[PDB]
Enzyme design. Structure first.
Site, short mmCIF file in Angstrom:
data_model
loop_
_atom_site.label_atom_id
_atom_site.label_comp_id
_atom_site.label_asym_id
_atom_site.label_seq_id
_atom_site.Cartn_x
_atom_site.Cartn_y
_atom_site.Cartn_z
N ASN A 187 4.94 0.57 2.85
CA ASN A 187 5.02 -0.48 3.88
C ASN A 187 6.48 -0.78 4.33
O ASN A 187 6.87 -1.90 4.67
CB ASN A 187 4.34 -1.75 3.51
CG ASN A 187 2.84 -1.83 3.39
OD1 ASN A 187 2.14 -1.18 4.16
ND2 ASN A 187 2.34 -2.71 2.51
N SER B 31 0.93 -1.14 0.00
CA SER B 31 0.00 0.00 0.00
C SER B 31 0.96 1.19 0.00
O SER B 31 1.83 1.11 0.89
CB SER B 31 -0.80 0.16 1.30
OG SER B 31 -1.73 -0.87 1.50
N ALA C 255 -0.38 -0.24 5.69
CA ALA C 255 -0.20 -1.29 6.69
C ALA C 255 1.01 -1.06 7.57
O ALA C 255 2.04 -0.69 6.99
CB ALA C 255 -0.10 -2.60 5.90
#
Ligand SMILES: O=C(O)Cc1cccc([N+](=O)[O-])c1
Ligand SMILES: [Ca+2]
Lengths: 557, 206
Positions: free
Chosen positions: A241, A1, A69
């Site tokens: 991430n 992400s 995340a």
């Protein structure tokens, strides 16, 4: 992400630009749900996964927010001591404590029902037990007991009007999630949220700890310890991430590492390339990073040094010169199924051979199979998520850095051979494999591109649509499931904010009983493929001006 | 009016909710979700509670047991019972709004029931707060924030110990699964701050 936030000092024609690409996979109907909420202290617009009460991506006209995340380590396993006699009990601080238990019945359509029992200790639910050692493993989450408060912090944060109000809500979100901030004045911010355990001295968080009492967490670290930055000296915040901060430890997953080879460098290079960026340029980073091969940058210097003394007719050297002319951006041919340059296929076969010769050979079976993937593995439907650099490849990158890597090489992964000899051997493997399938003229190699599927099954593997509802896209793009952009204080409009998003296949998933598909069932699917976007409206005027319908309800609780 | 909820949809079908109190606001949200995504929402509800095999059969029994073993539903109901009235309204409003649209759907199924319900042979049931909370827990806490491989790491470590001996097996483990790597590219630059804790990396707990 991924996410890139651009502040005052890096923004051109605005004070702040936030671009978010949450990557959960691709689904039909759409993973996220668009929704504007106007009343009771709320004035918001955006989209959010599974239509949660709180919007994970959106803005309230004053501040904007987004997530990626976190992957911090917030789960540890406790090895509980059982007893052959006195079952259902476990030793804890010198006494034999009884477990919580519950019975469950699974009802099965056209089958017999099944019942089983779930067990729980003070550390958490029991994952597995080893009767031989009389050990049971309990999974213990730092967020246990705060699920609902995290749902609520994500809802309340939509009302914050500044950093100080927003960080009060970030301090209550307990899952390992990165949170991002931008505002009308051009301030930007980041918090690696969540609850992390306060571990006893000597606790190695990568492996299990005895649950008998001495290793119990002491508590949870305070919010002051969570990595955070406000108005960074660089002028921007970028994440894919990767690690939050220097010396922060990652999840204990064996397949997850934060090392010197990281895909966020690809975002960094593009944001450091230009002194300021406009909204159109910030959006355009989605298209470049979507198409970028992640391994070229990493291993091109190694390949170049190994083939430097070869002659021009040596095939190994020709493979390296093809890679040297390429910028790593994949582009489809006109056939809609093969890539314009063969570079990804070459790195794929080279890396598979290199890993089998180095990392894979040092690890005992069957753990060697954790480290053999090149990162290019897919099927005909294409990747189920983002493309990344594989664990094997991160470990190999440390080994090819020599004494420039901070990671002690306890075993020599090259096994006494000079690096170049292992690199040239793998390059001969590569030439053998590829030339056999495509022939000797590298210039006409037409290698298969990756495609993209919006699946009918959800991420658990459960149907959420009929199988024919699956949508196919010819180009695989390493980008968010949805993309959204918020631009604060545009010089080019009178509006204080402008925002856009794209939620494909569409807002609605409705299909009538006669098979008539809603009007908004797939009207965003072509937009998605061409890197287009639609406007998000917030003010009453804008909503009224673009209204297609209205429904009024009269209800009393 | 305190009893009025106004729903305006834009050119892309995106709903905007206008209401004056919490309960009406989230009731509006719930109601448009039920209009747009009712089958998706119902399969997500079964996915997050482990009740898929009741409508889809034997291939999902393992799946449902795995979901149920990974959470403790009474712990979630206790969190919901401690909410203040304002917070509880969010969740209750949302379930009530969904239910009002599900009531109309189950009353006029010839034009309002989503085709997939016919295809898969079953009809929507009514939601409570617990069900709305479980959409977020089953999919965000319960598996986007639940990652560990500690047991498998210990199996790798033991296998490296056998191959390279006890001290050497540990140093190779740190080579393959380091705790931290100081050259990792970080979102926060080192001039702003670094993480203050230092951790054991010797498996000192054995
Ligand atoms: O990146 C992931 O692997 C999944 C994930 C998990 C939690 C939040 C996310 N996001 O875009 O907020 C994405
Ligand atoms: Ca851990």
């Amino acid at each position: 992400s991924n996410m890139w936030v651009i502040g005052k000092s890096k923004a051109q024609d605005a004070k702040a630009i936030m671009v978010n690409g949450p990557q959960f996979g691709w689904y039909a109907p759409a993973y996220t749900y668009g929704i504007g909420l106007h009343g009771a202290g709320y004035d918001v617009t955006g989209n959010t996964p599974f239509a949660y009460p709180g919007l994970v991506f959106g803005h309230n006209g004053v501040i904007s927010w987004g997530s990626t995340a976190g992957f911090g380590d917030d789960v540890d396993i406790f090895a509980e001591r059982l007893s052959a006699e006195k079952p259902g009990y476990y030793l804890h601080n010198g006494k034999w404590v009884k477990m919580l238990s519950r019975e469950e019945t699974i009802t099965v359509k056209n089958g017999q029902a099944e019942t089983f029992t779930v067990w729980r200790t003070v550390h958490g639910n029991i994952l597995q037990t080893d009767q031989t050692t009389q050990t049971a493993y309990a999974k213990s989450r730092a967020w246990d007991g705060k699920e609902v408060a995290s749902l609520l912090a994500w809802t309340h944060q939509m009302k914050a009007k500044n950093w100080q109000q927003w960080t009060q809500q970030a301090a209550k979100q307990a899952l390992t999630i990165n949170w991002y901030y931008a505002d009308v004045n051009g301030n930007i911010g980041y918090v690696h949220t969540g609850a992390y355990p306060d571990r006893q001295s000597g606790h190695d968080p990568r492996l299990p700890v005895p649950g008998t009492g001495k290793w119990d967490w002491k508590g949870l670290l305070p919010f002051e310890m969570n990595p955070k930055v406000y108005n960074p000296q660089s002028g921007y915040i970028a994440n894919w991430n990767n690690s939050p901060q220097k010396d922060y430890p990652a999840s204990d997953l064996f397949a997850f590492l934060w090392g010197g080879a990281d895909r966020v460098t690809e975002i960094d290079r593009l944001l450091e390339q230009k002194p300021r960026l406009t909204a159109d340029q910030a959006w355009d980073v989605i298209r470049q990073t979507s198409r970028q091969d992640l391994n070229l940058r990493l291993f091109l210097p190694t390949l170049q040094a190994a083939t430097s003394g070869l002659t021009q007719s040596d095939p190994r050297r020709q493979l390296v010169e093809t890679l040297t002319r390429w910028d790593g951006i994949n582009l489809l041919n006109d056939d809609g199924k093969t890539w314009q340059q063969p570079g990804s296929a070459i790195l794929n076969v080279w890396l598979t051979s290199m890993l089998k010769r180095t990392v894979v050979a040092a690890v005992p079976m069957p753990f060697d199979k954790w480290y053999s993937a090149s990162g290019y593995e897919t099927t005909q439907d294409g990747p189920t998520g983002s493309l990344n650099i594989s664990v094997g490849a991160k470990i190999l990158y440390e080994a090819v850095q020599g004494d420039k890597s901070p990671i002690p090489q306890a075993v020599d992964l090259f096994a006494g051979k000079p690096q170049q000899e292992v690199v040239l051997a793998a390059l001969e493997d590569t030439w053998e494999t590829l030339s056999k399938r495509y022939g000797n003229n590298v210039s006409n190699w037409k290698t298969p591109a990756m495609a993209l599927t919006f699946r009918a099954n959800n991420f658990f593997g459960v149907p959420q649509a009929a199988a024919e509802e699956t949508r196919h896209q010819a180009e695989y793009q390493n980008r968010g499931t949805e993309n959204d952009m918020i631009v604060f204080s545009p010089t080019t409009s009178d509006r204080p904010v402008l925002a856009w998003d794209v939620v494909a296949p569409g807002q609605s998933g409705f299909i009538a009983p006669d098979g008539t598909v809603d009007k908004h069932y797939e009207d965003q699917l072509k937009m998605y493929e061409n890197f287009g976007r639609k406007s998000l409206w917030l003010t009453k005027q804008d909503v009224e001006a673009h209204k297609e319908s209205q429904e009024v309800l009269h209800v009393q609780r | 009016s305190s009893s009025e909820i106004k729903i305006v949809r834009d050119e892309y079908g995106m709903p905007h909710i206008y209401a004056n109190d919490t309960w009406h606001l989230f009731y509006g949200y719930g109601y448009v979700v039920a209009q747009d995504r009712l089958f998706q929402m119902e399969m997500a509800r079964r996915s997050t509670q482990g009740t898929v095999a009741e409508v889809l059969g034997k291939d999902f029994v393992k799946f449902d047991k795995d979901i149920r073993r990974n959470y403790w539903p009474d712990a979630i109901r206790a969190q919901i019972a401690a909410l203040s009235p304002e917070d509880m309204s969010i969740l209750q409003g949302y379930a009530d709004g969904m239910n009002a649209w599900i009531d109309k759907v189950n009353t006029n199924p010839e034009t309002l029931l989503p085709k997939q319900f016919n295809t898969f042979g079953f009809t929507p049931k009514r939601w409570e707060p617990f069900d709305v909370a479980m959409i977020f827990v089953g999919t965000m806490a319960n598996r986007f924030s639940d990652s560990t491989s500690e047991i498998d790491n210990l199996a790798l470590l033991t296998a490296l110990k056998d191959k390279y001996g006890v001290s050497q097996g540990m140093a190779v483990f740190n080579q393959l699964k380091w705790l931290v790597n100081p050259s990792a590219p970080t979102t926060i630059a080192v001039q702003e701050s670094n993480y203050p804790l230092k951790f054991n990396q010797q498996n000192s707990q054995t």
